[PDB]
Amino acid sequence: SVLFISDLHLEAERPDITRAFLSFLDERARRAEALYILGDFFEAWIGDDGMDAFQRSIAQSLRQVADGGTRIYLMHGNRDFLIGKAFCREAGCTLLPDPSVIDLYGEPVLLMHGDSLCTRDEAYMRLRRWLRNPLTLWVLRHLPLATRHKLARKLRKESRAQTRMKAVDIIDVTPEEVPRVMRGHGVRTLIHGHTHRPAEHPLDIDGQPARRIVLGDWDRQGWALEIDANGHRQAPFPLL
Ligand SMILES: CCCCCCCCCCC[C@@H](O)CC(=O)N[C@H]1[C@@H](OP(=O)(O)O)O[C@H](CO)[C@@H](O)[C@@H]1OC(=O)C[C@H](O)CCCCCCCCCCC
């Protein structure tokens, strides 16, 4: 079996989420063939060179699971798109680009964090285009660590202000983007996070049924999607 999680937003000041995650690693990820983390694993990331004691300890916990034979893949989200090779080497995980198509029990399956689908959120689309611009990444990594933390706090503050003001239809995925990107990748299954609305959505692509599975965020309870050759299930579990 294979596990999918996202939107944990791990941080030092949420030990309840950390405890749930570490229990999940021991109880479920150790026995899985693979674990996919589809973005926003951490609350924020300023670059691997800024990793703190807490973040290093999370890397070590992943490494224990990877060394047991579980393959771990990590995809960027909007909080942690600066995770690099140094972190993944310490964690024993593989960095997966957004988007990625994997083979899952013989079916091609598209994986994304999900924010790139939110094309009606024009203010966010503009921010994303600027944040991911190679010129932006260049200047950002030339900022001192403390100044990077300052700008990360400022972005979080403005995001918290602005997201409260937006309608749910503006911040959720644009419906017609889903068949468009799934057709382009030749898949009938898409798995993503970001939107915090765990669900499975049936849809049509060119007269053929397809599905979009949305992973849950861990703010109030943990979530995991588990797939094996016979079926799949997403279910929550309590934070510790
Ligand atoms: C190198 C270190 C520093 C730089 C890199 C740091 C990386 C870590 C920081 C993460 C910030 C991230 O939270 C921003 C973001 O992604 N917001 C969108 C997201 O909301 P979340 O709050 O992340 O859950 O998802 C929401 C739903 O999709 C969406 O709504 C939010 O997007 C916004 O709210 C964006 C606003 O609409 C526009 C904000 C522009 C802010 C400009 C601030 C800079 C000040 C400029 C002064 C001239």
Numbering used by the authors: 2 to 241
Paper text:
Proteins without Mn2+ ions were also successfully crystallized in two different space groups. A C2 form was obtained with no Mn2+ ions added during crystallization, and a P21 form was obtained by adding EDTA prior to crystallization. These crystals also contained two PaLpxH molecules in the asymmetric unit. No major changes were observed in the protein structures regardless of the presence of Mn2+ ions, suggesting that Mn2+ ions do not have a major effect on the protein structure.
In the fourth step in this pathway, UDP-2,3-diacylglucosamine is hydrolyzed to 2,3-diacylglucosamine-1-phosphate (also called lipid X) and UMP. This step is catalyzed by the specific pyrophosphatase LpxH in 70% of gram-negative bacteria, including E. coli and Pseudomonas aeruginosa, and by LpxI in the remaining 30%345. LpxH shares sequence similarity with metallophosphoesterases and requires Mn2+ ions for phosphatase activity. PaLpxH consists of two domains: a catalytic domain homologous to metallophosphoesterases (MPEs) and a helical insertion domain (HI domain) inserted in the middle of the catalytic domain.
